[PDB]
């Protein structure tokens, strides 16, 4: 499924991401825009054998289990297929674990490159 | 997860068709390496079937993306590359070997693959 | 009196909506003057009905064109300006006042108005 | 109706336009591209009260009768509504009368600006 921007913002708000660990809602919508363009089925195979999954492109080396990634820790204790669900519940639950890891949202390359330091609230306006 | 624009580019029976599609263009290397993708979808134009797929630039998905439509039995591959400027918001499209047969409805389908309408309305682009 | 992008731009009840659509963009003079056009068509997205129209630069039609969707219900006007470079197989799009509600299927409809699929398949775009 | 490029080329050839009055097929396809982008319903209102109609944007002051243009000569003896059909026949018949002048295709502003003097055959390149 491809979420609409406001549709995703509302879902993320319902799941408690607005200002979670100090990150306002727009940071999360912006991260999704540049990791997956709001597509729940997005997948990216990496050269190290891992794969990034779902709307927030969560990686299989440390966070979910896809049974084919070396050095797997499955810290979200979920199969990576759960991160490809049409509703965002699993992805939000796992993202909350990741962002509390220490370096916050810097865990997301897309957030660092396209969202950090910008007017992220723009992503939830007109909603 | 498996049939992708990346795999078509490498396939022994489809690589020549892919090369014909991109001849004269300067697509980013990420396209052939394999970007962030979703499963191929089937669409019918007239009485002919196409596999439609897309992919975006890793970690900059909303900025650069590509859609390709492929007819296995027709040995034809046409595509659309899109880059959105991070200062003007203008969207620059490059059409890849769009043959006349796909010059109208095929262009519509490829763009729908990028907007999200095709993924959300899988059976909404089977034109007569 | 055919409904056209030009008539909307000059209409007493629609001029304000047209100004909002083109705000921040500097379009060629031919748009307001009234380019080469075809009849408006009805398209229904969700439970909202729109009049979708297009026009192109007189005597240079394949080079520059514009599509507009107008909702009387909301008064709102959203559009797409397109300039073509045949020699590079490229097309530059400028999205005009696309609100979130029209960000997925609305963009598809506006593009279909320009490719010709909307005119050739009038009942194929009521998403 | 919006024609595809090669689709229109084929119809114009079947209608006898290839080399008509010495103008090869590409000239006619190119003129239609820039007058209407191959749209049979195209209409352009002019400041003088006349209107250009159809795929080849034929004017109502001299060529067709639209019932609302002062001084109409109707030199093609056809209602302008007949030039808005999905079949290009009425437009072709009128175009042949128009071009049969010492100035030829210069009667079309779009042809003068985008087609005249160019490698017009490119407009039928790749066409079956």
Short mmCIF file of C-alpha atoms in Angstrom, two decimals:
data_model
loop_
_atom_site.label_atom_id
_atom_site.label_comp_id
_atom_site.label_asym_id
_atom_site.label_seq_id
_atom_site.Cartn_x
_atom_site.Cartn_y
_atom_site.Cartn_z
CA UNK A 1 0.00 0.00 0.00
CA UNK A 2 1.08 3.58 -0.67
CA UNK A 3 -0.04 5.84 2.14
CA UNK A 4 -1.10 9.39 1.62
CA UNK A 5 1.07 11.87 3.57
CA UNK A 6 -1.69 13.01 5.95
CA UNK A 7 -3.07 9.48 6.19
CA UNK A 8 0.37 8.32 7.42
CA UNK A 9 0.79 11.31 9.75
CA UNK A 10 -2.55 10.46 11.40
CA UNK A 11 -1.62 6.77 11.75
CA UNK A 12 1.74 7.66 13.27
CA UNK A 13 0.03 10.04 15.70
CA UNK A 14 -2.45 7.35 16.71
CA UNK A 15 0.49 4.99 17.41
CA UNK A 16 2.19 7.53 19.67
CA UNK A 17 5.12 8.78 17.59
CA UNK A 18 4.40 12.49 17.94
CA UNK A 19 7.27 13.79 20.08
CA UNK A 20 8.34 10.27 21.01
CA UNK A 21 11.80 10.67 22.62
CA UNK A 22 11.57 14.31 21.59
CA UNK A 23 10.99 13.80 17.86
CA UNK A 24 7.97 15.72 16.60
CA UNK A 25 5.62 13.94 14.18
CA UNK A 26 7.03 15.54 11.04
CA UNK A 27 10.39 13.85 11.61
CA UNK A 28 8.72 10.45 11.29
CA UNK A 29 6.66 11.32 8.23
CA UNK A 30 9.74 12.84 6.57
CA UNK A 31 11.84 9.75 7.43
CA UNK A 32 9.21 7.53 5.77
CA UNK A 33 9.06 9.80 2.72
CA UNK A 34 12.74 9.35 1.99
CA UNK A 35 13.15 5.76 3.14
CA UNK A 36 10.14 4.31 1.25
CA UNK A 37 8.01 7.16 -0.20
CA UNK A 38 5.25 5.86 2.11
CA UNK A 39 5.14 2.41 0.51
CA UNK A 40 4.48 -0.37 3.06
CA UNK A 41 6.03 -3.08 0.89
CA UNK A 42 9.35 -1.40 0.18
CA UNK A 43 12.42 -3.69 0.32
CA UNK A 44 16.09 -2.89 -0.31
CA UNK A 45 18.72 -5.61 -0.51
CA UNK A 46 22.14 -4.51 0.82
CA UNK A 47 25.61 -5.73 -0.20
CA UNK A 48 26.28 -7.13 3.30
CA UNK A 49 23.51 -9.71 2.92
CA UNK A 50 20.92 -7.80 4.98
CA UNK A 51 17.74 -6.23 3.69
CA UNK A 52 15.81 -3.09 4.70
CA UNK A 53 12.06 -3.60 5.19
CA UNK A 54 8.88 -1.59 5.03
CA UNK A 55 7.80 1.98 5.35
CA UNK A 56 10.73 2.88 7.62
CA UNK A 57 13.27 0.52 5.95
CA UNK A 58 14.25 -1.32 9.14
CA UNK A 59 17.34 -3.51 8.74
CA UNK A 60 17.53 -7.30 9.11
CA UNK A 61 20.99 -7.46 10.65
CA UNK A 62 19.99 -6.09 14.05
CA UNK A 63 16.22 -5.66 14.13
CA UNK A 64 14.09 -8.30 12.45
CA UNK A 65 14.54 -11.84 11.31
CA UNK A 66 14.42 -12.71 7.57
CA UNK A 67 16.31 -16.00 7.94
CA UNK A 68 18.93 -15.09 5.36
CA UNK A 69 21.01 -12.36 7.04
CA UNK A 70 24.42 -13.00 8.66
CA UNK A 71 24.91 -11.75 12.24
CA UNK A 72 21.18 -11.46 12.95
CA UNK A 73 20.16 -10.27 16.43
CA UNK A 74 16.42 -9.82 15.83
CA UNK A 75 16.15 -7.19 18.59
CA UNK A 76 12.55 -6.36 17.68
CA UNK A 77 11.85 -10.09 17.85
CA UNK A 78 9.68 -10.21 14.77
CA UNK A 79 9.93 -11.71 11.32
CA UNK A 80 10.84 -9.05 8.79
CA UNK A 81 7.56 -9.83 6.99
CA UNK A 82 5.76 -8.17 9.92
CA UNK A 83 7.39 -4.90 8.88
CA UNK A 84 5.74 -5.19 5.46
CA UNK A 85 2.21 -5.10 6.91
CA UNK A 86 -0.38 -2.71 5.40
CA UNK A 87 -1.03 -1.15 8.84
CA UNK A 88 2.05 0.40 10.45
CA UNK A 89 1.79 -1.12 13.93
CA UNK A 90 4.79 -3.47 13.75
CA UNK A 91 7.00 -0.87 12.10
CA UNK A 92 6.11 1.73 14.75
CA UNK A 93 6.71 -0.70 17.64
CA UNK A 94 10.11 -1.62 16.24
CA UNK A 95 11.00 2.02 15.42
CA UNK A 96 10.35 2.99 19.05
CA UNK A 97 12.95 0.39 20.13
CA UNK A 98 15.47 1.63 17.55
CA UNK A 99 15.20 5.37 18.32
CA UNK A 100 15.74 4.74 22.04
CA UNK A 101 19.04 3.00 21.19
CA UNK A 102 21.22 6.02 21.89
CA UNK A 103 21.78 8.06 18.74
CA UNK A 104 18.06 8.66 18.19
CA UNK A 105 16.81 9.07 14.64
CA UNK A 106 20.33 9.19 13.26
CA UNK A 107 19.65 5.44 12.88
CA UNK A 108 17.85 6.41 9.66
CA UNK A 109 20.08 7.52 6.81
CA UNK A 110 17.14 9.16 5.05
CA UNK A 111 16.24 11.17 8.14
CA UNK A 112 19.83 12.40 8.52
CA UNK A 113 20.14 13.43 4.86
CA UNK A 114 16.73 14.89 4.10
CA UNK A 115 15.05 15.72 7.39
CA UNK A 116 17.50 16.61 10.16
CA UNK A 117 17.72 20.38 10.62
CA UNK A 118 14.81 21.21 8.29
CA UNK A 119 11.27 22.53 8.86
CA UNK A 120 9.99 19.01 9.44
CA UNK A 121 6.54 20.26 10.54
CA UNK A 122 5.97 20.97 6.85
CA UNK A 123 5.29 17.25 6.55
CA UNK A 124 2.14 17.42 8.66
CA UNK A 125 0.63 20.68 7.47
CA UNK A 126 -2.56 20.84 5.46
CA UNK A 127 -3.71 17.68 7.25
CA UNK B 1 10.37 -10.24 -3.99
CA UNK B 2 12.57 -11.25 -6.93
CA UNK B 3 11.41 -10.04 -10.37
CA UNK B 4 12.82 -6.52 -10.36
CA UNK B 5 14.12 -3.92 -12.77
CA UNK B 6 17.56 -4.95 -11.55
CA UNK B 7 17.00 -8.62 -12.42
CA UNK B 8 15.60 -7.74 -15.86
CA UNK B 9 18.78 -5.78 -16.58
CA UNK B 10 20.87 -8.88 -15.87
CA UNK B 11 18.65 -11.67 -17.19
CA UNK B 12 20.08 -13.49 -20.19
CA UNK B 13 16.77 -13.30 -22.10
CA UNK B 14 15.89 -9.73 -21.16
CA UNK B 15 19.21 -7.90 -20.95
CA UNK B 16 19.23 -6.98 -24.64
CA UNK B 17 15.73 -5.52 -24.23
CA UNK B 18 16.82 -3.55 -21.15
CA UNK B 19 19.85 -2.22 -22.99
CA UNK B 20 17.56 -1.06 -25.78
CA UNK B 21 15.36 0.69 -23.23
CA UNK B 22 18.21 2.65 -21.64
CA UNK B 23 20.26 3.36 -24.74
CA UNK B 24 21.23 7.03 -24.84
CA UNK B 25 20.29 7.67 -21.22
CA UNK B 26 22.38 8.24 -18.10
CA UNK B 27 20.47 6.41 -15.35
CA UNK B 28 22.14 6.40 -11.93
CA UNK B 29 24.13 3.29 -11.16
CA UNK B 30 21.70 2.49 -8.35
CA UNK B 31 19.11 1.36 -10.91
CA UNK B 32 21.10 -1.60 -12.16
CA UNK B 33 22.52 -2.36 -8.69
CA UNK B 34 18.93 -2.57 -7.41
CA UNK B 35 17.18 0.20 -5.50
CA UNK B 36 14.36 0.11 -2.98
CA UNK B 37 11.57 -1.83 -4.68
CA UNK B 38 8.13 -3.43 -4.39
CA UNK B 39 6.70 -6.49 -6.14
CA UNK B 40 5.88 -6.40 -9.83
CA UNK B 41 2.21 -5.96 -10.72
CA UNK B 42 0.33 -7.11 -13.81
CA UNK B 43 -1.57 -4.70 -16.11
CA UNK B 44 -3.41 -5.29 -19.39
CA UNK B 45 -3.37 -2.87 -22.31
CA UNK B 46 -5.61 -3.99 -25.14
CA UNK B 47 -5.23 -7.76 -25.04
CA UNK B 48 -1.56 -7.73 -24.01
CA UNK B 49 -0.04 -8.29 -20.57
CA UNK B 50 2.72 -6.31 -18.86
CA UNK B 51 4.65 -6.70 -15.62
CA UNK B 52 4.99 -3.23 -14.09
CA UNK B 53 7.67 -2.57 -11.51
CA UNK B 54 9.32 0.36 -9.83
CA UNK B 55 12.24 1.23 -7.60
CA UNK B 56 13.64 4.34 -5.85
CA UNK B 57 17.04 5.62 -4.81
CA UNK B 58 18.00 4.04 -1.47
CA UNK B 59 17.42 6.44 1.44
CA UNK B 60 16.31 9.21 -0.93
CA UNK B 61 13.20 7.51 -2.20
CA UNK B 62 10.99 10.49 -2.68
CA UNK B 63 13.69 12.22 -4.78
CA UNK B 64 14.58 9.78 -7.55
CA UNK B 65 12.66 6.80 -8.85
CA UNK B 66 12.03 4.63 -11.92
CA UNK B 67 9.15 2.57 -13.32
CA UNK B 68 9.45 -0.10 -16.01
CA UNK B 69 6.80 -2.06 -17.89
CA UNK B 70 7.74 -5.37 -19.50
CA UNK B 71 5.93 -7.74 -21.84
CA UNK B 72 7.70 -11.12 -21.74
CA UNK B 73 6.13 -12.52 -24.90
CA UNK B 74 6.60 -9.23 -26.75
CA UNK B 75 10.24 -8.83 -25.73
CA UNK B 76 9.53 -5.14 -25.05
CA UNK B 77 10.59 -2.97 -22.13
CA UNK B 78 9.64 0.69 -21.72
CA UNK B 79 10.28 2.92 -18.73
CA UNK B 80 10.09 6.25 -16.94
CA UNK B 81 12.74 7.90 -14.79
CA UNK B 82 11.80 10.72 -12.41
CA UNK B 83 13.92 13.15 -10.40
CA UNK B 84 12.38 15.73 -8.09
CA UNK B 85 14.48 18.84 -7.41
CA UNK B 86 15.09 19.62 -3.74
CA UNK B 87 14.83 23.38 -4.27
CA UNK B 88 12.10 24.00 -6.85
CA UNK B 89 10.04 20.85 -6.34
CA UNK B 90 9.93 20.48 -10.14
CA UNK B 91 9.63 16.86 -11.34
CA UNK B 92 11.80 16.02 -14.33
CA UNK B 93 10.75 12.99 -16.32
CA UNK B 94 12.82 11.01 -18.80
CA UNK B 95 10.92 8.57 -21.01
CA UNK B 96 12.81 5.36 -21.81
CA UNK B 97 12.21 3.85 -25.22
CA UNK B 98 8.52 4.41 -25.20
CA UNK B 99 7.37 2.83 -28.46
CA UNK B 100 4.30 4.32 -30.14
CA UNK B 101 2.08 1.50 -28.87
CA UNK B 102 2.80 2.66 -25.31
CA UNK B 103 2.93 6.37 -26.09
CA UNK B 104 -0.41 7.11 -24.39
CA UNK B 105 -1.82 4.51 -21.97
CA UNK B 106 1.65 3.12 -21.24
CA UNK B 107 2.85 6.56 -20.16
CA UNK B 108 -0.20 6.79 -17.86
CA UNK B 109 0.52 3.38 -16.32
CA UNK B 110 4.19 4.15 -15.73
CA UNK B 111 3.36 7.43 -14.04
CA UNK B 112 0.69 5.67 -11.91
CA UNK B 113 3.40 3.20 -10.82
CA UNK B 114 5.29 6.18 -9.39
CA UNK B 115 2.41 8.12 -7.81
CA UNK B 116 1.10 5.10 -5.98
CA UNK B 117 -2.23 4.84 -7.83
CA UNK B 118 -1.28 1.59 -9.50
CA UNK B 119 -0.30 -0.08 -6.21
CA UNK B 120 -3.52 1.06 -4.55
CA UNK B 121 -5.79 0.29 -7.54
CA UNK B 122 -4.20 -2.89 -9.02
CA UNK B 123 -7.02 -3.55 -11.44
CA UNK B 124 -7.66 0.12 -12.26
CA UNK B 125 -5.32 0.46 -15.23
CA UNK B 126 -6.39 -2.26 -17.61
CA UNK B 127 -7.38 -0.09 -20.57
CA UNK B 128 -9.44 -1.35 -23.52
CA UNK C 1 -19.39 29.63 -23.07
CA UNK C 2 -17.24 26.54 -22.67
CA UNK C 3 -15.70 25.85 -19.30
CA UNK C 4 -11.93 26.35 -19.73
CA UNK C 5 -8.91 27.10 -17.58
CA UNK C 6 -9.06 30.61 -19.03
CA UNK C 7 -12.74 31.10 -18.10
CA UNK C 8 -12.01 29.87 -14.57
CA UNK C 9 -9.17 32.38 -14.23
CA UNK C 10 -11.48 35.23 -15.22
CA UNK C 11 -14.66 34.04 -13.53
CA UNK C 12 -16.03 36.12 -10.68
CA UNK C 13 -16.62 33.09 -8.45
CA UNK C 14 -13.53 31.15 -9.52
CA UNK C 15 -10.78 33.74 -10.00
CA UNK C 16 -9.74 33.62 -6.36
CA UNK C 17 -9.35 29.85 -6.53
CA UNK C 18 -7.27 30.16 -9.73
CA UNK C 19 -4.98 32.71 -8.09
CA UNK C 20 -4.39 30.34 -5.21
CA UNK C 21 -3.56 27.53 -7.61
CA UNK C 22 -0.88 29.53 -9.43
CA UNK C 23 0.47 31.32 -6.36
CA UNK C 24 4.27 31.24 -6.40
CA UNK C 25 4.43 30.09 -10.00
CA UNK C 26 5.00 32.33 -13.01
CA UNK C 27 3.13 30.72 -15.90
CA UNK C 28 3.35 31.76 -19.58
CA UNK C 29 0.83 34.38 -20.64
CA UNK C 30 -0.93 31.95 -22.94
CA UNK C 31 -2.59 30.15 -20.05
CA UNK C 32 -4.80 33.01 -18.87
CA UNK C 33 -5.32 34.25 -22.43
CA UNK C 34 -6.76 30.85 -23.30
CA UNK C 35 -4.76 28.23 -25.16
CA UNK C 36 -5.86 25.40 -27.44
CA UNK C 37 -8.29 23.37 -25.37
CA UNK C 38 -10.67 20.43 -25.29
CA UNK C 39 -13.93 19.97 -23.36
CA UNK C 40 -13.88 19.54 -19.62
CA UNK C 41 -14.61 16.01 -18.35
CA UNK C 42 -16.16 14.80 -15.12
CA UNK C 43 -14.01 12.66 -12.82
CA UNK C 44 -15.05 11.37 -9.40
CA UNK C 45 -12.38 10.68 -6.76
CA UNK C 46 -13.76 9.23 -3.57
CA UNK C 47 -17.06 11.05 -3.11
CA UNK C 48 -15.79 14.22 -4.73
CA UNK C 49 -16.56 15.27 -8.28
CA UNK C 50 -14.14 17.33 -10.36
CA UNK C 51 -14.16 18.99 -13.73
CA UNK C 52 -10.83 18.14 -15.38
CA UNK C 53 -9.58 20.20 -18.31
CA UNK C 54 -6.44 20.91 -20.23
CA UNK C 55 -4.98 23.42 -22.69
CA UNK C 56 -1.77 23.78 -24.70
CA UNK C 57 0.32 26.58 -26.12
CA UNK C 58 -1.29 27.77 -29.40
CA UNK C 59 0.63 26.50 -32.42
CA UNK C 60 3.27 24.85 -30.19
CA UNK C 61 0.97 22.35 -28.56
CA UNK C 62 3.29 19.43 -28.11
CA UNK C 63 5.77 21.69 -26.29
CA UNK C 64 3.86 23.18 -23.39
CA UNK C 65 0.57 22.35 -21.78
CA UNK C 66 -1.44 22.47 -18.59
CA UNK C 67 -4.11 20.36 -16.85
CA UNK C 68 -6.43 21.55 -14.07
CA UNK C 69 -8.95 19.81 -11.85
CA UNK C 70 -11.67 21.95 -10.30
CA UNK C 71 -13.97 21.07 -7.43
CA UNK C 72 -16.92 23.47 -7.08
CA UNK C 73 -17.76 21.67 -3.83
CA UNK C 74 -14.57 22.98 -2.25
CA UNK C 75 -14.00 25.69 -4.88
CA UNK C 76 -10.39 24.39 -4.99
CA UNK C 77 -8.28 24.27 -8.13
CA UNK C 78 -5.24 22.02 -8.58
CA UNK C 79 -3.07 21.80 -11.66
CA UNK C 80 -0.09 20.50 -13.56
CA UNK C 81 2.12 22.48 -15.94
CA UNK C 82 4.29 20.53 -18.36
CA UNK C 83 7.06 21.57 -20.74
CA UNK C 84 8.56 19.08 -23.20
CA UNK C 85 12.05 18.66 -24.65
CA UNK C 86 11.75 16.21 -27.56
CA UNK C 87 15.50 16.09 -28.15
CA UNK C 88 16.15 14.66 -24.68
CA UNK C 89 12.95 12.65 -24.27
CA UNK C 90 12.37 14.75 -21.15
CA UNK C 91 9.33 16.46 -19.62
CA UNK C 92 9.43 19.01 -16.78
CA UNK C 93 6.43 19.07 -14.47
CA UNK C 94 5.37 21.85 -12.13
CA UNK C 95 2.68 20.78 -9.63
CA UNK C 96 0.25 23.62 -8.88
CA UNK C 97 -1.36 23.74 -5.43
CA UNK C 98 -1.70 19.96 -4.98
CA UNK C 99 -3.31 19.45 -1.57
CA UNK C 100 -2.91 16.15 0.25
CA UNK C 101 -6.29 14.76 -0.89
CA UNK C 102 -5.13 14.87 -4.51
CA UNK C 103 -1.51 13.85 -3.93
CA UNK C 104 -1.82 10.30 -5.26
CA UNK C 105 -4.85 9.74 -7.48
CA UNK C 106 -5.24 13.47 -8.29
CA UNK C 107 -1.72 13.57 -9.75
CA UNK C 108 -2.51 10.48 -11.79
CA UNK C 109 -5.69 12.06 -13.18
CA UNK C 110 -3.92 15.33 -14.09
CA UNK C 111 -1.17 13.39 -15.85
CA UNK C 112 -3.81 11.29 -17.69
CA UNK C 113 -5.42 14.54 -18.87
CA UNK C 114 -2.10 15.41 -20.56
CA UNK C 115 -1.15 12.01 -22.01
CA UNK C 116 -4.55 11.57 -23.59
CA UNK C 117 -5.65 8.54 -21.59
CA UNK C 118 -8.38 10.51 -19.80
CA UNK C 119 -9.91 11.63 -23.11
CA UNK C 120 -9.61 8.21 -24.70
CA UNK C 121 -10.97 6.38 -21.59
CA UNK C 122 -13.47 8.79 -19.99
CA UNK C 123 -14.77 6.22 -17.50
CA UNK C 124 -11.43 4.78 -16.49
CA UNK C 125 -10.33 7.27 -13.85
CA UNK C 126 -13.00 7.37 -11.16
CA UNK C 127 -10.78 6.02 -8.38
CA UNK D 1 -9.74 11.30 -29.46
CA UNK D 2 -6.03 11.60 -28.90
CA UNK D 3 -4.06 9.77 -31.59
CA UNK D 4 -0.70 8.12 -31.08
CA UNK D 5 2.05 9.48 -33.40
CA UNK D 6 2.53 6.41 -35.53
CA UNK D 7 -1.23 5.78 -35.39
CA UNK D 8 -1.87 9.22 -36.92
CA UNK D 9 0.92 8.78 -39.49
CA UNK D 10 -0.73 5.60 -40.72
CA UNK D 11 -4.14 7.28 -40.96
CA UNK D 12 -2.72 10.29 -42.81
CA UNK D 13 -0.96 7.98 -45.26
CA UNK D 14 -4.17 6.03 -45.88
CA UNK D 15 -5.82 9.40 -46.50
CA UNK D 16 -3.40 10.36 -49.27
CA UNK D 17 -1.31 13.02 -47.56
CA UNK D 18 2.12 11.49 -48.12
CA UNK D 19 3.73 13.75 -50.75
CA UNK D 20 0.46 15.61 -51.37
CA UNK D 21 1.48 18.85 -53.13
CA UNK D 22 5.05 17.74 -52.59
CA UNK D 23 4.82 17.52 -48.80
CA UNK D 24 6.11 14.23 -47.39
CA UNK D 25 4.14 12.52 -44.60
CA UNK D 26 6.32 13.80 -41.74
CA UNK D 27 5.27 17.38 -42.49
CA UNK D 28 1.63 16.55 -41.79
CA UNK D 29 2.34 14.57 -38.65
CA UNK D 30 4.60 17.36 -37.35
CA UNK D 31 1.95 20.03 -38.14
CA UNK D 32 -0.65 18.09 -36.16
CA UNK D 33 1.80 17.62 -33.28
CA UNK D 34 2.23 21.32 -32.84
CA UNK D 35 -1.27 22.46 -33.71
CA UNK D 36 -3.18 20.01 -31.45
CA UNK D 37 -0.77 17.37 -30.10
CA UNK D 38 -2.86 14.87 -32.10
CA UNK D 39 -6.15 15.69 -30.32
CA UNK D 40 -9.16 15.61 -32.62
CA UNK D 41 -11.26 17.83 -30.33
CA UNK D 42 -8.80 20.70 -29.99
CA UNK D 43 -10.32 24.18 -30.21
CA UNK D 44 -8.60 27.58 -30.02
CA UNK D 45 -10.61 30.84 -29.77
CA UNK D 46 -9.00 33.80 -31.52
CA UNK D 47 -9.30 37.50 -30.69
CA UNK D 48 -10.87 38.28 -34.07
CA UNK D 49 -13.92 36.15 -33.24
CA UNK D 50 -12.91 33.12 -35.27
CA UNK D 51 -11.91 29.74 -33.85
CA UNK D 52 -9.39 27.11 -34.97
CA UNK D 53 -10.81 23.57 -35.03
CA UNK D 54 -9.55 20.05 -34.82
CA UNK D 55 -6.38 18.08 -35.22
CA UNK D 56 -5.04 20.53 -37.80
CA UNK D 57 -6.58 23.69 -36.23
CA UNK D 58 -8.48 24.87 -39.30
CA UNK D 59 -9.88 28.41 -38.95
CA UNK D 60 -13.59 29.36 -39.10
CA UNK D 61 -13.08 32.70 -40.84
CA UNK D 62 -12.12 31.22 -44.21
CA UNK D 63 -12.51 27.44 -44.12
CA UNK D 64 -15.39 25.98 -42.16
CA UNK D 65 -18.69 27.35 -40.95
CA UNK D 66 -19.24 27.44 -37.19
CA UNK D 67 -22.27 29.74 -37.29
CA UNK D 68 -20.66 32.38 -35.08
CA UNK D 69 -17.82 33.85 -37.15
CA UNK D 70 -18.58 37.08 -39.03
CA UNK D 71 -17.48 37.04 -42.68
CA UNK D 72 -17.16 33.24 -42.85
CA UNK D 73 -16.26 32.15 -46.40
CA UNK D 74 -16.66 28.40 -45.74
CA UNK D 75 -14.19 27.52 -48.51
CA UNK D 76 -14.20 23.85 -47.43
CA UNK D 77 -18.04 23.68 -47.38
CA UNK D 78 -18.12 21.93 -44.05
CA UNK D 79 -19.47 22.72 -40.56
CA UNK D 80 -16.61 23.27 -38.15
CA UNK D 81 -18.17 20.58 -35.95
CA UNK D 82 -17.26 18.06 -38.67
CA UNK D 83 -13.59 18.87 -38.12
CA UNK D 84 -13.82 17.66 -34.48
CA UNK D 85 -14.49 14.01 -35.35
CA UNK D 86 -12.47 10.97 -34.27
CA UNK D 87 -11.92 10.16 -37.99
CA UNK D 88 -9.53 12.63 -39.62
CA UNK D 89 -11.27 12.57 -43.00
CA UNK D 90 -13.01 16.00 -42.98
CA UNK D 91 -9.82 17.66 -41.70
CA UNK D 92 -7.73 15.99 -44.40
CA UNK D 93 -10.15 16.95 -47.18
CA UNK D 94 -10.04 20.56 -46.01
CA UNK D 95 -6.27 20.53 -45.51
CA UNK D 96 -5.83 19.48 -49.14
CA UNK D 97 -7.83 22.55 -50.29
CA UNK D 98 -5.86 24.82 -47.96
CA UNK D 99 -2.41 23.64 -49.00
CA UNK D 100 -3.16 23.89 -52.72
CA UNK D 101 -1.99 27.50 -52.71
CA UNK D 102 1.35 29.03 -53.68
CA UNK D 103 2.21 29.35 -49.98
CA UNK D 104 1.48 25.68 -49.20
CA UNK D 105 1.91 24.51 -45.62
CA UNK D 106 2.84 28.00 -44.49
CA UNK D 107 -0.91 28.22 -43.89
CA UNK D 108 -0.23 26.47 -40.55
CA UNK D 109 1.60 28.60 -38.00
CA UNK D 110 2.65 25.46 -36.13
CA UNK D 111 4.20 23.99 -39.25
CA UNK D 112 6.09 27.25 -39.94
CA UNK D 113 7.50 27.40 -36.43
CA UNK D 114 8.31 23.77 -35.65
CA UNK D 115 8.38 21.79 -38.87
CA UNK D 116 9.44 23.90 -41.85
CA UNK D 117 13.10 23.30 -42.74
CA UNK D 118 13.61 20.43 -40.29
CA UNK D 119 14.22 16.73 -40.79
CA UNK D 120 10.47 16.09 -40.73
CA UNK D 121 10.90 12.41 -41.61
CA UNK D 122 11.83 12.01 -37.92
CA UNK D 123 8.10 12.27 -37.18
CA UNK D 124 7.41 8.99 -38.93
CA UNK D 125 10.67 7.32 -37.80
CA UNK D 126 10.08 3.99 -36.10
CA UNK D 127 6.56 3.82 -37.54
CA UNK D 128 5.19 0.67 -39.14
#
